[model samples]
Target chain A: MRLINLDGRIHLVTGDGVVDVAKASEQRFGPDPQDLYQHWDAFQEWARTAALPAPSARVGTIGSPAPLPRQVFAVGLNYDDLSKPEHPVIFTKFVSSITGPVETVQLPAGSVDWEVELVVVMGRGGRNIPEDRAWEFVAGVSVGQDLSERDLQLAGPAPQFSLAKSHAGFSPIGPELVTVDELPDPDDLELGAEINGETVQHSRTSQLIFPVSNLIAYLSDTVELYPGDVIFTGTPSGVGMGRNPKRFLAPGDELRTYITGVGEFTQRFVT
Target chain B: MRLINLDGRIHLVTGDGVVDVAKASEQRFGPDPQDLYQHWDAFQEWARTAALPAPSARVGTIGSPAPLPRQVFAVGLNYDDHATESGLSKPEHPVIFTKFVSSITGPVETVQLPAGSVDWEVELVVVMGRGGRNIPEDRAWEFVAGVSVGQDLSERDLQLAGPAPQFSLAKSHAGFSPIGPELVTVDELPDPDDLELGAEINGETVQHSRTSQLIFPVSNLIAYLSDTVELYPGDVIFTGTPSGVGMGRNPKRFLAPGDELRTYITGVGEFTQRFVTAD
Candidate 1:
C-alpha cells in the first residue's frame, strides 16, 4: 500500500483506489490523539485489506516524509567495503544537510557520483545507546542521495568530504517515509539509483558493513541527534564512480531514487 | 599641577602644596579644566583669592583614567632599540595584539614567571580633544588609559628575534588593563609615553626601536582611528608598547606593572599574567 499525506490529511489505500481516513476519523484537530490514533488504526486495517497501488514516488521527487527536520548529519566512507580511498571517510562532520522530496539538487561544478543508501530516520533521540539497542531510537527508514563531488573531493590531502559534499543541495532525501513497522526487515530492503533514467547504483541494505545501529551508536558518541535527525545509513555498491568513463550529472541531469516497499521520485537540475 | 577632583573641584600645587579652584568657580562637582588642563591659566588667580582648604579634602588613590575597555589592541615590535636585536627594524603597520583590562589590578603573580618573563609597563593614555584642530577631517585628539595592565612580557620566543639584544613579547597583551595616573614617573609632567615611555622598552639591553612619526600622530591616528568611532574628544588612546622587555634575547627577567601612571598599586591582580618554561 502507498501511504500519502495530502494537505496534512492521512489517507489509506483501498481496493478500488484511495480513501481519506483523516476525514473518516472526524478529528477535532487538537493534540487529542484519540482521533489520530483511531484514524491510524483504520489506515492500518485498510493497509492490510487494500489492493496495493503501483509504487511511483522516488526519493527526491516526493515530499520528505519527515518534514521540518531540526538537525541533520551525514557520514561518508565509514564503510570498510571501499578501502579508505584517499582519506579516511570518518574525517568530516557537517552541521546540517537537508532537502525535500523531488528537490532538484544542483550537482557541484564537477563530477557527481551516487550512493544507493539505506537512510534511517530516528524515531527518538538517544545518545550512546549501546550498539545492541540503537535501533530503538530510529523513527523509520528512507533513502539518501549521498551525492559526491569527484573533482573537489580529490584535490585535498584530507578527504574533501566537507567542501565537496557541503555545496548547497548536496544531500537529497525523501518522498514518503515508510514507517518502521511497515517494513518487515529494513536490513533486507533492496535499493538502487538511476541517472537520466539509466540504472546506476544497484545494492541491498544488507550490504552495509557497519549497519544502521552501528551508525547511530557511533554517531551519538559525539553530537546529540534530536528528533528529525536523519542518518544516511551508508550507501551500497554500484555507485557511478565505479564505472569505466564514469557518467556524471549536468545542469539538466535527472536523478530517480527508490527502495522496496517504499516509493521513488524524479528531480531534474535546471540552470 | 597634580589635578585633584575633590568633590568636582579642580586643584593645583600652590606654594602651600594643594589648592581648590572648584570652590571659586561655584560649579560644585567633577574635575574642571583648571585641574585637568596642563597649563598655568587664569584659574590659578581665582584659586589664590578663593582661599580654599588643603587638597586633602580629596581621598581616592586615583582610578584608571577611563573605565573598563572592550578590546585592547597592542602594537608589536615598534621600537628600533628593541627591533635591532630582532632581524628587521622596518615595520609597515602596527602588528595588533589584544588584552583585557579593568579598574583594579594585581601587584604581582608567580604565574607571571615560571611560564615566561612577566615584563613591565610604563604606559600612558592620550585624551582625544573634542573641540580642537585635528590632523584628520573630523577627528580630534581623544583620551586613553593611564596605566592599564601589569602586562606580562613572556619571553618564550627569544630565539626568533635577532641576537644583539632579546626576543620581543609575541603574544604581548592579554588579560586586564588600566593602571592609574598617581603612582610616579621618573620625572613629572604628564609624561606622554608617546614622548617618553613609548621609546623605552627592554631597557639599554634593547637597541631601542622608536615608533615612526612617534607620539601617536594626531592626523594619522585620527585618520586610521576615526575609521571606527566618532571621538568627542576626551577619548584616551593607549600609546604603543616601548622597547624594554625581558622577552628580548639580551635582557631576560620580567618587569612589573604597578598602578599610578607612577607607582601606585590599587591591589588587584586581575591585571597580573604569569608564564612558564617551554620544557
Candidate 2:
C-alpha cells in the first residue's frame, strides 16, 4: 500500500482511488501527515480492511509524506565509490530544510549540487536498535534530494556539512512513501538521478558500503531514533564535485530523482 | 529576572521567592518549561507587574531552562587558544554542527559513559527569545532570550573514528548535553560576551577562558546562522569551548567514572555532573 500527502492530508493511494485516512477511520486519526507515524501500527491494522469508497479527486498538490519530522539524520560517503570509510560519516539537514517532493528551488549564491538518496522515515522509536531488527523500526521509504551548496560546505577549515546542506528547501523527500513490505528487496533497488533528461547518476542501492540496517544500528547506538524521524541513507558517486571539470545546478536546470518501485520527483532551479 | 525549570514547571526566581508562571498567570502560560519561550514576549509582559503571593516552596529538582529545543547549533574552535592547542588553524567562519535534542538533559544529573574516551567542553549556551532569518549582527542580541551554562560531552573515539569527523553523532550520546542552573536573561549580565567561563573535574580547573576569547562572538554566530537556517525561540547554540580538552593534553586525559564535572559561567550560573560507567 502507498501513503501520500494530498493537499497536506494523509491519504492511502489504492487501485480504485485515494482513501482519506482520518475520514475513512471516522477521525480515528488526524489529517496531519506527520501525526500518522505516532500511531503507525494501529493505522496499518485499520488500513488492512476499511470500508469501500469511490474514486476521489487526486488533483491536489503533493507534499512530503512525513512533513514535520522532529529530527533528520543524513549520512555522508556511504557509497563504496565515494571513498570507503571506517564508519559512516553522519550529519543533519535541519528540519526547516524539508520541503515537498516537487518544487522550484531557489539557488543559493554558490555552487548548488544534487545528491539523490533513498530516504527512510521511522515508524517506531528505540535506542540501541540491533542491525537485524532495524527494518522493524522503519515506517516507509521515499525519494530525497540532499541539495548541497559546495562552496559553503567546504568554506571553513573544518567542513560545515550540516549548515551548508540545510538552506531553505534543501532537503526534499516524497511523491509518496512506500512501505518496505511492498518492495521486491528493501536492501537493493535501482535508484538514480537525471538533469534535463540527461542521466548524471545511476546505481543500485546494493552498492552502499554501509547498508540501511548498518546505518540504523550505528545511529541508534548513540542517538535514540524517534518516530517520524527521517534519514537520508546517502547518495552514490557521479555527484557534480566528482566530475573532472566540475558541474553544478544553474538557473532553468530541471533535476529529476527516482527509485524503482518508489516514484520520482522533479526540482526546478531558479536564481 | 531569572527563569528556571523546577520540577518540570516554569518558575521565576526572585529574591523574595519563586513564582510559578503558569499558576500565577492562571494558566495563561503552560507548565511545560519549553513552552515559556514560545510565548516569551507576552509572558515577559505579563510577568512585569502581575501581583503575586508570598514565597512558595523554593526547593525542587533543577532542570534545563530551555529543554526540548527544536534545534541546537554548536561551534568548533571558536577560541584562538583552543585552536592552537587542537593543532588546527583559526577558522575563518563558524564551524557549525548539531547536538541532537534527545541528548539534552537537565543539570545535576549523572551521565553514563559510552564505550570510548569521553571529554568535557564547558560553553556559554545561547537561548533564543525571538527567532528570525537574516538577522543583522548589530541587533542580534535582541533575538536572544538568555544564556546558560552547558557541557558539550563528546566521545572522542567515535568523533575521530571516520575519515570525515562524526561530530554530530559522536557528541549526541544519551545525556551528552547537560544545560542550566537557570536561564539568566541577557539584561542580567554586565557583558554577556566578556564573562569568564571554565570547567573543573574533581575540583581541579582543567579548562578556563572568557567568552570574549570567542573567535566568532555570540552576535556574529547569530547573524551567521540566521543567514541560512531560521532561528526559532527556545533554540540553543553551544558557543564552542576553550583550550583544555582531554584530547589536547600531553598524555591525553579523558573522563572517568566518579569524576564530578563542575561547569560555570561567571554572573550566569553553574551546574554539577557525575560521570558513571554505562550499565
- Residue runs of model 1 more than 4 Å from their true location after superposition: A1-61, A78-97, B1-279
TM-score of each: 0.42, 0.96
Relative to the true structure, candidate 1 reaches a TM of 0.42
Global lDDT for candidate 2? 0.88
Query: If you assessed candidate 1 against the hidden native complex, which CAPRI class would it receive?
Result: incorrect
Question: What tens digits encode model 2's per-residue C-alpha lDDT throughout B75-142?
Answer: 99899988887777789899999999888877866889988999999999999989888999999998
lDDT score for residue A258 of model 1: 83
Best by DockQ: 2
Q: After superposition, how far is residue A206 of candidate 1 from its true place, in Å?
A: 1.0
Which 10-residue window of candidate 2 chain A scores lowest in summed lDDT? A50-59
Question: Clash number for every model?
Answer: 82, 1
Best by lDDT: 2
What would the C-alpha RMSD of candidate 2 be, to one decimal place? 1.9
